[PDB]
Amino acid sequence: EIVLTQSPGILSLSPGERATLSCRASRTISRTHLAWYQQKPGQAPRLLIYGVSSRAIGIPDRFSGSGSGADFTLTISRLEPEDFAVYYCHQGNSPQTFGQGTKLEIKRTVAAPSVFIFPPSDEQLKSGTASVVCLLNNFYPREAKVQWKVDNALQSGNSQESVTEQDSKDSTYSLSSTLTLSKADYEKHKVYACEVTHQGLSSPVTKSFNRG
Amino acid sequence: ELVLTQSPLSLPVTLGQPASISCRSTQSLVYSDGNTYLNWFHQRAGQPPRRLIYKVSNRDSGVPERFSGSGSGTDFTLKISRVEAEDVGIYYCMQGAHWPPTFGGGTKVEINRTVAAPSVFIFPPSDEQLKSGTASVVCLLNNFYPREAKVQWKVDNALQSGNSQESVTEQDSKDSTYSLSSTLTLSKADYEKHKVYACEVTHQGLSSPVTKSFNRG
Amino acid sequence: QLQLVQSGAEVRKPGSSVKVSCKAGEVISWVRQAPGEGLEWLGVFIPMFGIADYAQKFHGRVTISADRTTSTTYMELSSLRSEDTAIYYCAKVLQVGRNLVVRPLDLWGQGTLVTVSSASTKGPSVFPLAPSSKSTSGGTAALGCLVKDYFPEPVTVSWNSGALTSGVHTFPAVLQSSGLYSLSSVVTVPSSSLGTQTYICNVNHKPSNTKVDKKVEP
Amino acid sequence: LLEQSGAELKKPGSSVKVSCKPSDGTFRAYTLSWVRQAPGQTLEWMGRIMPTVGITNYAQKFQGRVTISADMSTATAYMELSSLRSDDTAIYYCAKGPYVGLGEGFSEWGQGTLVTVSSASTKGPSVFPLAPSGGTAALGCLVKDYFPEPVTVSWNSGALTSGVHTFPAVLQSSGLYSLSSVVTVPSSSLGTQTYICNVNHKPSNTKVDKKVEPK
Amino acid sequence: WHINSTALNCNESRPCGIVPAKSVCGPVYCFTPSPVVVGTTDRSGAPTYSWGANDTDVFVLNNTRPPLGNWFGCTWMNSTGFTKVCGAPPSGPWITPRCMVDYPYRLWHYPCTINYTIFKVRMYVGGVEHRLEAACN
Ligand SMILES: *[C@@H]1O[C@H](CO)[C@@H](O[C@@H]2O[C@H](CO)[C@@H](O)[C@H](O)[C@H]2NC(C)=O)[C@H](O)[C@H]1NC(C)=O
Ligand SMILES: *[C@@H]1O[C@H](CO)[C@@H](O[C@@H]2O[C@H](CO)[C@@H](O)[C@H](O)[C@H]2NC(C)=O)[C@H](O)[C@H]1NC(C)=O
Ligand SMILES: *[C@@H]1O[C@H](CO)[C@@H](O)[C@H](O)[C@H]1NC(C)=O
């Protein structure tokens, strides 16, 4: 079985520059049977480079692959808004393994998130459960941190996060953390906070509310 | 359908002298593809066989020039120009011309250097063995030749029989000697009833039988 | 024969076997992709010889079938588990060189979502995420809908029947510990129109035949 | 070099599997044969397997009672010998024959696997030293009451190999085996050097390093 | 037989020795007289699994007469689509002036034998018994 290690994990470049992706292997991939694919969020993959140097039909001349042996490189001559996506390399033998992928995102000015918190609705409390939602909108980079505070007590293992794909209008991520409790445990406390830490925030911003 | 006769079965030759082993089959070993497939093998004691001759005239690597094979059809011959102390053990002829591939009967080769007397040693039993139910006395014969050797156990100068075990080694490829070890197994209660234990060794190289004994017991 | 199609999405329970059709030529292949995970190579198939190779991982439970006449290459995975929940793609290998199966795949199917879970098909429970005039940042308030406890994927959420698109963020669905999915869709609007504008989220869950219009108010 | 499985004691009627592993760890183009040698008999060829292509051929004697299987990506060849009998105890070798086929013989041989068949139980060996004249000094180390064979003895951890003599095993009336091992060393080094015989019995899975001292 | 080591090099569709896998398509069949498939193999190496793409994949078909040696001879289909043979039959593998060895890809390698009849025959070579399938007229 072959393993395909791609570097780097996430590439952050601006439209107009040039990208250089690497697909290091552990064993030689037969003779130039290596392929490259791009995948946009919500779509099937697309074949860019085949045979490590040949270009596929309809693929613009900006893309170009190179390398041989265990080291391979795919280089986009000039990045445009339609090129930022996840790229995979495809290898010559029975395993026919794939890479884990590299994310190409637009490098943008560090934007601080807009923190909104939502108490659980009364229609949900009548069902026996209580979910507290915390909203982070239009921030960059993607690396963000949230910590729930039920009566100022640091919670753990009872919340799930969800991050949107990078927007195309302003190239910003969005996160939503949902703190799930029971109807009994929700009415046992009064303070429910949401501590947010981010690069664009000099001080950790906390949005909280009280029952009432 | 087919059988191989290995003659002679035991070929004792003096050191530094020619020696030939004949291997005769019943059918011709020329086979269909015209290549005569007969092989010779050397086996030592304790080691697996190794190939010396992969075709009737073809010598395998790592084998001295003193070896050579001959013959064609039914009669074959493995001749040794100079016999050294290294060339001891069993020799087999293998035929791969007719299914199934069988090995020869085996030819044990013995060297004829003579007149080597044994250095007889005796070992009293260990205390840990006396702590157990039975105890054993060991008599040793080291670097002797010929193999013919007669050891007798004298318990309080009286002959013993029926409870002694002898173990003879293979002929050493280094100096062409033998080694024999005797073991007298008896209970501890029957061990205390005597004081002097002895083993008397008679051999061709010894004019008078040598005996080693210990007075404790 | 401009492009090939695939079978519709389906949901199965553990231990069952699911089949996916691929209707459209040589070297039809198959791959899958877990949600937010790299692609895994499934067995490839030759129409000329009718025999198919497979990967080591699932070789004992993958079978590739092919239909005569029209290209309807099948794909059956036996002994399904929670790890197999992914979207499966069939693909044709293009511009084959001397070697038949070695050349890469070109076109792909639309994608068949296979969900392996023990939970049953349940409609969503839409709860309103009420806005607040104090949490605003620059005169922009936030309000949304909490699509909770539904199965299986997917679900579509729109606002004002598509009239409100700017500032709408519909987060991907998270898989709760009970086996059901939970989704949240928010939208940013100016604080001045909180008492004068009507905001309704249009939640549509096709697998359960459930459509709910929920009115969000402060 | 060819690795092989260890010694085994199997009661009559059961089966036995002997492994054969190449030193390279990858199979190549050669035919792998299985040759045994019964006590007091000539070498008997059992079967041949071509592991690169998967062709097996057995002799008419062991037909239906022997099966040779080789596993790929593991670099091991197995010999399943079912329906054992008291006459089937022997030393089993795995020999490398040319991919061309048998006929030219075997270039490399296995180390030898001694499979013993008996209804008696497996017993571990007890060791007893021999306290230290032909011009030299003697020194021994005795192994008694072990079953089944074999037993390997190394003096000084594989360092003392000159002058060693390991006697063959002898059968006792109680059904147990016993072997001795003696070396000859000068008398000057009797008080300035210690000797430690290492005894290993694979079925017993016990290794003892008794120390001999002149008394 | 495994398709992992099977050479697929189809385009626009006497001593055996060794054959490069770049010029063969479909399985390589050899007859002991019993049919045996040989997988793609490195030059005196482990069986490779590349569908005969890699340029070092070959077919080690070194041959000796079959009673105690390798298969009689091998037959296969090559890239252009011609039946290439080697060794000696038990043209095609004939065990009898009017009988061929039946194997899955017999019809593909020799289409002229499509109207042949299939029988279950016994062939004794050396001292080993072979129960194979035969296609006769
Ligand atoms: C496949 O086999 C065929 C027949 O053996 C090859 O065709 C021959 O090629 C040689 C090349 O010099 C010509 O001289 C012969 O006239 C051809 N024979 C026929 C019947 O056309 C073919 O070349 C082989 N495939 C490859 C890769 O060469
Ligand atoms: C077939 O594939 C194997 C594995 O990728 C190649 O083996 C490598 O060969 C190179 C060059 O001879 C060596 O430096 C490597 O050490 C080999 N790798 C391994 C894992 O053995 C082989 O070269 C390929 N054949 C061809 C013709 O490209
Ligand atoms: C196969 O035959 C060729 C040609 O005679 C020879 O060069 C090669 O060494 C042989 N390989 C094996 C593994 O027998």
**Domain segments of chain B: what residues?**
4-110, 119-214
E67 sits in which H/E element? none
Between CA B96 and CA B84 the distance in angstroms is 29
- Evaluate whether E72 touches E94 at the Cβ level (below 8 Å): no
Residue B65 has a CB neighbour count (10 Å cut-off) of 8
A189 inside 8 A of chain E by CB:
no
How many domains would you assign to chain E?
1
Strand order in the sheet with C72-73: C5-6, C22-23, C72-73
Q: Residue C100: which residues within 8 A CB-CB, separation 6 or more?
A: C26, C27, C46, C48, E8, E9, E10, E25, E51
Between CA A141 and CA A110 the distance in angstroms is 6
3-state secondary structure C22-88: EECCCCEEEEEECCCCCEEECCCECCCCCCECCCCCCHHHEECCCCCCCCEECCEECCCCHHHCEEE
Shortest distance between the Cα of E53 and any Cα of chain A, in A, equals 7
Could you tell me which chains touch chain D, where touching means 3 or more CB pairs under 8 A? B, E
Tell me the three state secondary structure of residue D106.
coil
B106 sits in which H/E element? none
Torsion angle defined by CA atoms of residues C76, C81, C87 and C90, in that order, rounded to the nearest 10 degrees: -20
Of B137, B136, B140, the residue nearest B151 (C-alpha): B140
Shortest distance between the Cα of E87 and any Cα of chain D, in A, equals 13
- Evaluate whether A149 touches A206 at the Cβ level (below 8 Å): yes
Nearest ligand to residue D28 Cα? 3
- Evaluate whether C40 touches C31 at the Cβ level (below 8 Å): yes
Q: In which domain, by residue range, is E42 found?
A: 1-137
Between CA E94 and CA E96 the distance in angstroms is 5
Between CA E21 and CA E23 the distance in angstroms is 5
Tokens matching residue D97: 């024959």
Tell me the three state secondary structure of residue B139.
strand
Q: Where are the beta strands (DSSP E) in chain D?
A: 2-4, 8-10, 16-22, 30-37, 43-50, 55-58, 66-71, 76-81, 90-98, 113-117, 126-130, 137-146, 152-155, 164-166, 170-171, 177-179, 181-185, 195-201, 206-212
Which atom of ligand 3 lies nearest, measured to the CA of E60? 1
Nearest ligand to residue D99 Cα? 3
- Evaluate whether C29 touches C90 at the Cβ level (below 8 Å): yes
Count Cβ atoms within 10 A of the Cβ of residue D141 and give its class: 0-12 exposed, 13-18 middle, 19 or more buried.
buried
Q: Which CATH class is domain B119-214?
A: mainly beta
Its CATH architecture, for the domain A114-210, is: Sandwich (2.60)
Residue list, ligand 2 pocket, CB within 6 Å: A 27-28, 30-31; E 54-56
Interface test with C, best of E8, E24, E109 (most C CBs within 10 A): E8
Using CA coordinates, name the residue in chain A closest to C183.
A162
Beta bridge partners of C146: C127, C184
Dihedral over Cα of C127, C130, C136, C142: its sign: positive
Strands B134-144 and B119-123, by their bridges, are antiparallel
Beta bridge partners of E135: E100, E118
Q: How was this structure determined?
A: X-ray
Its CATH architecture, for the domain C125-216, is: Sandwich (2.60)
Count Cβ atoms within 10 A of the Cβ of residue C165 and give its class: 0-12 exposed, 13-18 middle, 19 or more buried.
exposed
- Distance between the two ends of chain B, CA-based, in angstroms? 63
Beta bridge partners of C114: C10, C86
Q: Residue D197: which residues within 8 A CB-CB, separation 6 or more?
A: D127, D129, D141, D153, D154, D155, D181, D209, D210, D212
Q: Which amino acid is at E34?
A: S
Backbone angles phi, psi at D52, to 5 degrees: -70, -35
Could you tell me which chains touch chain E, where touching means 3 or more CB pairs under 8 A? A, B, C, D
Q: Residue D173: which residues within 8 A CB-CB, separation 6 or more?
A: none
User: Do B119-214 and B4-110 have the same topology in CATH?
Assistant: yes
Of E136, E122, E137, the residue nearest E33 (C-alpha): E122
D29 closest CB neighbour out of E60, E69, E128: E60
Strands A173-182 and A191-197, by their bridges, are unpaired
Contacts of B25 in chain D (CB under 8 A): none
Using CA coordinates, name the residue in chain C closest to A44.
C108
Shortest distance between the Cα of A97 and any Cα of chain E, in A, equals 13
Contacts 24+ apart (CB under 8 A), B46-53: B46/B170, B48/D93, B48/D109, B48/D110, B48/D111, B48/D112, B49/B92, B49/D43, B49/D93, B49/D109, B50/D109, B51/D105, B51/D106, B51/D107, B53/B78
Tokens matching residue D184: 């000859």
- Region for B192 from its dihedrals, namely left if φ exceeds 0, alpha if ψ lies in -120 to 50, beta otherwise: alpha
Tokens matching residue B115: 């007149």
- Evaluate whether C42 touches C76 at the Cβ level (below 8 Å): no
User: Do C125-216 and C5-116 have the same topology in CATH?
Assistant: yes
Location of structure tokens 């090939």:
C4
Of C110, E2, A105, the residue nearest D53 (C-alpha): E2
Dihedral over Cα of B4, B10, B16, B19: its sign: negative
Of A138, A144, A208, the residue nearest A179 (C-alpha): A208
Between CA C206 and CA E115 the distance in angstroms is 57
Contacts of B184 in chain D (CB under 8 A): none
Ligand 2 mean position, distance from CA A28 (Å): 6
Q: Which CATH number fits domain D126-212: 2.170.120.20, 2.60.40.10, 3.30.70.260, 1.20.120.160?
A: 2.60.40.10
Its CATH architecture, for the domain D2-117, is: Sandwich (2.60)
The CATH number of the domain covering residues in A4-106: 2.60.40.10
E23 touches ligand 1 (CB under 6 Å): yes
Q: Which amino acid is at B196?
A: V
Between CA B205 and CA B115 the distance in angstroms is 5
Query: CB-hemisphere CA count at 13 Å for D182?
Result: 29
Superfamily of domain C5-116: Immunoglobulins (2.60.40.10)
Q: Residue D2: which residues within 8 A CB-CB, separation 6 or more?
A: D20, D21, D22, D23, D94, D96, D108, D109, D110, D111
Interface test with E, best of B29, B33, B55 (most E CBs within 10 A): B33
Do B101 and E67 lie within an 8 Å CB cutoff?
no
Between CA D109 and CA D111 the distance in angstroms is 7
Tokens matching residue B131: 């702590």
Strands C112-116 and C10-12, by their bridges, are parallel
Using CA coordinates, name the residue in chain A closest to C132.
A118
E81 touches ligand 1 (CB under 6 Å): no
In our burial notation (b when 16+ CB lie closer than 10 A, e otherwise), range C83-96 reads ebbbbbbbbbbbeb
Ligand 1 mean position, distance from CA E23 (Å): 10
Tell me the three state secondary structure of residue A155.
coil
Of A72, A71, A84, the residue nearest A15 (C-alpha): A84
Which atom of ligand 3 lies nearest, measured to the CA of D29? 13
Question: Residue B189 to residues B131, B133, B135, C197: CA-CA distances in angstroms?
Answer: 11, 8, 9, 114
Tell me the three state secondary structure of residue B69.
strand
Residue A86 has a CB neighbour count (10 Å cut-off) of 19
Beta bridge partners of E31: E35
Of B44, B36, B35, B64, the residue nearest B52 (C-alpha): B64
Nearest ligand to residue E23 Cα? 1
Between CA C10 and CA D27 the distance in angstroms is 44
- Region for E57 from its dihedrals, namely left if φ exceeds 0, alpha if ψ lies in -120 to 50, beta otherwise: beta
C40 closest CB neighbour out of A35, A47, A98: A98
3-state secondary structure C172-202: CCEECCCCCEEEEEEEEEEHHHHCCCCEEEE
Of A196, A138, A143, the residue nearest A172 (C-alpha): A138
Ligand 1 mean position, distance from CA E82 (Å): 8
Chain-centroid distance, C-alpha E71: 9
The CATH number of the domain covering residues in B4-110: 2.60.40.10
Chain-centroid distance, C-alpha C63: 23
Q: Which amino acid is at C54?
A: Y
Q: Residue D189: which residues within 8 A CB-CB, separation 6 or more?
A: none
Strand order in the sheet with B164-168: B119-123, B134-144, B178-187, B164-168
- Evaluate whether A42 touches C101 at the Cβ level (below 8 Å): no
Domain boundaries, chain C: 5-116, 125-216
